[PDB]
Amino acid sequence: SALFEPYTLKDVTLRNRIAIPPMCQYMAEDGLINDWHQVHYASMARGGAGLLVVEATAVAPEGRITPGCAGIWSDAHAQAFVPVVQAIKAAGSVPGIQIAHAGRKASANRPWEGDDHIGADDARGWETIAPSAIAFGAHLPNVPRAMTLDDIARVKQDFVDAARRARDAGFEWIELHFAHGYLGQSFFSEHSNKRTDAYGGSFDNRSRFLLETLAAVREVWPENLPLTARFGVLEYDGRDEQTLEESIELARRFKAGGLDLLSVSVGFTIPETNIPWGPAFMGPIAERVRREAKLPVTSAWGFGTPQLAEAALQANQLDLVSVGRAHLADPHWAYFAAKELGVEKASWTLPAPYAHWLER
Amino acid sequence: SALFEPYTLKDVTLRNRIAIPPMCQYMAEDGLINDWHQVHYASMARGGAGLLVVEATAVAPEGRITPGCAGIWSDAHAQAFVPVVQAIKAAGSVPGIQIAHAGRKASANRPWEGDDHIGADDARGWETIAPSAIAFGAHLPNVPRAMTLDDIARVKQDFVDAARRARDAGFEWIELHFAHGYLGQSFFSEHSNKRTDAYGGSFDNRSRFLLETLAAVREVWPENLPLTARFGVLEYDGRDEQTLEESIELARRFKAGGLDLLSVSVGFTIPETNIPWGPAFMGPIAERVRREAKLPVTSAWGFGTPQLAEAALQANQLDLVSVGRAHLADPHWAYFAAKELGVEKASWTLPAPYAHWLER
Ligand SMILES: Cc1cc2nc3c(=O)[nH]c(=O)nc-3n(C[C@H](O)[C@H](O)[C@H](O)COP(=O)(O)O)c2cc1C
Ligand SMILES: Cc1cc2nc3c(=O)[nH]c(=O)nc-3n(C[C@H](O)[C@H](O)[C@H](O)COP(=O)(O)O)c2cc1C
Ligand SMILES: CCOC(=O)/C(=N\O)C(=O)CC
Ligand SMILES: CCOC(=O)/C(=N\O)C(=O)CC
Ligand SMILES: CCOC(=O)/C(=N\O)C(=O)CC
Ligand SMILES: [Cl-]
Numbered sequence: 001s002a003l004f005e006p007y008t009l010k011d012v013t014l015r016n017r018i019a020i021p022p023m024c025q026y027m028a029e030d031g032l033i034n035d036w037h038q039v040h041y042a043s044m045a046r047g048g049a050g051l052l053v054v055e056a057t058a059v060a061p062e063g064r065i066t067p068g069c070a071g072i073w074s075d076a077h078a079q080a081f082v083p084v085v086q087a088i089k090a091a092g093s094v095p096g097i098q099i100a101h102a103g104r105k106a107s108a109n110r111p112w113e114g115d116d117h118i119g120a121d122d123a124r125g126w127e128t129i130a131p132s133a134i135a136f137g138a139h140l141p142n143v144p145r146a147m148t149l150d151d152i153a154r155v156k157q158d159f160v161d162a163a164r165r166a167r168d169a170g171f172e173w174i175e176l177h178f179a180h181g182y183l184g185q186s187f188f189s190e191h192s193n194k195r196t197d198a199y200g201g202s203f204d205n206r207s208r209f210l211l212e213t214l215a216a217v218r219e220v221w222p223e224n225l226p227l228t229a230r231f232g233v234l235e236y237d238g239r240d241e242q243t244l245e246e247s248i249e250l251a252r253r254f255k256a257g258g259l260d261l262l263s264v265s266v267g268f269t270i271p272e273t274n275i276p277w278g279p280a281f282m283g284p285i286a287e288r289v290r291r292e293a294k295l296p297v298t299s300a301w302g303f304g305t306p307q308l309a310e311a312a313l314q315a316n317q318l319d320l321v322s323v324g325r326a327h328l329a330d331p332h333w334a335y336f337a338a339k340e341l342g343v344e345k346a347s348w349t350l351p352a353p354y355a356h357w358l359e360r
Numbered sequence: 361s362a363l364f365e366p367y368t369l370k371d372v373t374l375r376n377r378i379a380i381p382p383m384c385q386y387m388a389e390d391g392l393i394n395d396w397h398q399v400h401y402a403s404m405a406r407g408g409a410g411l412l413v414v415e416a417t418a419v420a421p422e423g424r425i426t427p428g429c430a431g432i433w434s435d436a437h438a439q440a441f442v443p444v445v446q447a448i449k450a451a452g453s454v455p456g457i458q459i460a461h462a463g464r465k466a467s468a469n470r471p472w473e474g475d476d477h478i479g480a481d482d483a484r485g486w487e488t489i490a491p492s493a494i495a496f497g498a499h500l501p502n503v504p505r506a507m508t509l510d511d512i513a514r515v516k517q518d519f520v521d522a523a524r525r526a527r528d529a530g531f532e533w534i535e536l537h538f539a540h541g542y543l544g545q546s547f548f549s550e551h552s553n554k555r556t557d558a559y560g561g562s563f564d565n566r567s568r569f570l571l572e573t574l575a576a577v578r579e580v581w582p583e584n585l586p587l588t589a590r591f592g593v594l595e596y597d598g599r600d601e602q603t604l605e606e607s608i609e610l611a612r613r614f615k616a617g618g619l620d621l622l623s624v625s626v627g628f629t630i631p632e633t634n635i636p637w638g639p640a641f642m643g644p645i646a647e648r649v650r651r652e653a654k655l656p657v658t659s660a661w662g663f664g665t666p667q668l669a670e671a672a673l674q675a676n677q678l679d680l681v682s683v684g685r686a687h688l689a690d691p692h693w694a695y696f697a698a699k700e701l702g703v704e705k706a707s708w709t710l711p712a713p714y715a716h717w718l719e720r
């Protein structure tokens with residue numbers, strides 16, 4: 001089974017090709033994770049996945065999506081991740097973390113508490129920042145403040161500090177969150193970036209924030225640990241061919257800048273889109289990015305059955321299959337996939353106190 | 361669905377009829393549980409089961425099965441359980457504990473490390489005790505030391521102390537381990553009990569250790585929390601009709617002694633048996649105990665599919681369905697069962713950070 005072959009990138013070896021992608025839990029308080037996260041992450045790591053990327057973790061307080069989002073904007077915030085790192089490693093999985101800034105989608109309610117922008121009367125909210133003073137729309141109507149040059153320098157340094165803290169906390173894999181309509185994605189997209197300075201307009205200028213942030217993080221992130229990013233390569237906004245071509249060129253510049261793997265996603269920059277949701281629907285797009293930019297990739301959004309994950313690897317569409325919601329349903333999903341694909345000694349995907357009895 | 365109806369016993373209300381039976385993890389050190397257990401138990405409790413009975417926990421060091429077994433023979437051992445108790449409760453499940461003494465089956469290797477009696481050359485072994493100096497045989501050939509009346513008094517007091525410690529740790533449900541061929545079962549069975557004093561021979565005498573231990577525990581266990589026991593009611597040794605009749609009479613005496621629920625199991629007192637393993641094969645035996653002793657029951661050993669669990673409840677065979685190995689495979693099995701049985705808003709079997717996404 002291709003799904004259960006190990007994968008080596010820089011000095012890190014994953015025991016299989018199953019990655020748990022970042023999934024916000026909305027259970028932190030003042031950015032600090034707690035017993036929710038400790039058990040959540042440890043249980044999934046014991047389930048057998050080879051890589052576990054911790055949820056979007058804000059580089060600055062205003063970069064959280066919600067009041068429940070994790071943060072890493074202080075050393076004390078970073079130290080709270082140490083037992084999560086330890087538990088993931090103890091289970092034989094590789095600990096990664098996604099560092100993030102929500103941009104104009106920030107200051108929102110938890111998804112089961114309205115999922116919309118916090119009203120201006122509500123003291124839980126905060127002012128959001130973005131390349132330009134333009135609202136997402138729909139359920140996110142708040143207009144962000146357009147960033148100053150000093151804001152751009154500060155946020156870049158916040159990403160550096162977050163990567164420094166993630167390194168010192170023992171993470172072995174980092175993912176810059178440049179996707180899903182948050183700050184980095186919104187610098188790249190012409191929908192959201194109307195700047196007239198060095199950070200908007202041309203392709204070079206719209207790329208600048210992402211390339212400079214990658215370069216700044218590269219200075220503090222160890223050479224021997226994978227440096228990755230998530231990036232929305234099309235929007236399904238009727239501009240897909242032109243957008244994909246530009247996104248793939250940016251991926252080439254990421255590779256020149258030391259990026260080791262690209263998590264290929266959808267932009268979600270604006271609500272006026274027509275996304276063709278379906279099983280493994282990102283497969284062909286990830287394959288094109290992988291082949292044309294000559295960069296290893298992962299993707300998600302419907303690969304969460306064992307046969308779909310296996311097929312995507314054999315078709316050379318992905319190097320790692322990211323399986324999200326199936327791991328919320330069943331934290332031992334990797335063991336379920338091993339059984340379904342007929343792996344030999346499939347129960348030993350799990351630690352001995354489970355594996356011994358499930359082999360029978 | 362009957363499986364998802366709440367259940368009230370004394371002052372305790374379980375949110376459904378799914379119980380997780382005690383399952384030894386063999387991961388403790390010198391009786392102290394650790395982060396293996398913390399994550400293991402918290403994850404299963406978040407999975408939705410209404411009751412979680414913690415694994416066989418030894419009332420005395422020589423009452424462990426293996427060097428990996430949990431213990432509660434000191435106050436420090438009991439304090440180690442407090443975070444487990446509190447995590448189970450935080451998940452909305454009810455924390456129980458089975459307190460145990462392995463008798464002649466003690467001083468054994470972990471199941472994935474030979475599963476047999478520890479060799480006399482090995483620095484990990486200890487002297488075992490039992491009603492009579494007779495070995496189990498097979499992979500457990502060590503001859504135990506026959507208990508004196510002083511030993512009987514001491515072991516009873518060890519159960520009392522363990523119950524008091526479980527109470528102060530916050531457990532809301534206790535199970536005395538009188539099953540599976542360990543100390544309590546071995547006093548009841550004529551196979552292992554050849555005593556000639558007040559604790560062997562007649563039915564009254566063979567029952568005496570179990571009834572006296574129950575009565576001693578009842579003095580310190582709160583009247584408003586369920587007091588239960590697990591008991592092997594037959595052996596599949598060619599003596600089943602007489603043995604089950606005696607076992608059911610003992611259940612009547614347990615009820616008169618204040619027992620609130622019986623976990624009905626197989627004796628496993630000797631190796632020379634022919635157990636007819638099959639799906640829900642204990643159903644009819646548990647039904648007979650429940651009806652004839654007029655006492656609530658649970659049972660296990662093959663009820664771990666949603667339809668079998670539902671059928672057993674609808675047939676009035678059980679009051680709670682214990683589902684063990686299926687929760688090792690999938691800590692969220694209760695959610696899987698709610699989906700299979702078509703429960704309304706089945707995903708909200710799980711906490712919101714999972715439920716919100718699995719609904720859609
Ligand atoms: C609860 C939840 C939280 C998510 N949080 C993040 C996140 O923090 N960062 C991110 O890039 N994507 C996030 N996403 C997207 C997932 O990483 C993934 O792409 C998505 O679940 C699709 O994969 P799946 O079909 O296997 O679930 C989240 C998705 C869910 C359901
Ligand atoms: C790993 C494991 C540990 C067990 N530990 C205990 C125990 O500590 N006490 C006990 O009474 N039974 C124990 N048993 C029996 C279970 O409680 C249960 O009766 C058995 O797993 C059958 O139910 P199932 O078919 O749902 O797995 C254990 C079983 C397993 C597989
Ligand atoms: C078809 C709709 O496209 C738009 O008007 C747009 N950007 O171009 C926005 O949504 C602003 C948030
Ligand atoms: C619209 C797609 O957005 C996501 O997948 C997501 N949460 O749902 C994140 O990226 C949180 C940082
Ligand atoms: C074969 C019957 O014995 C059991 O189920 C068991 N572990 O497997 C225990 O009771 C541990 C105390
Ligand atoms: Cl751990």
Ligand SMILES: [Cl-]
Pocket residue numbers: 364375376408709
């Ligand atoms: Cl429930």
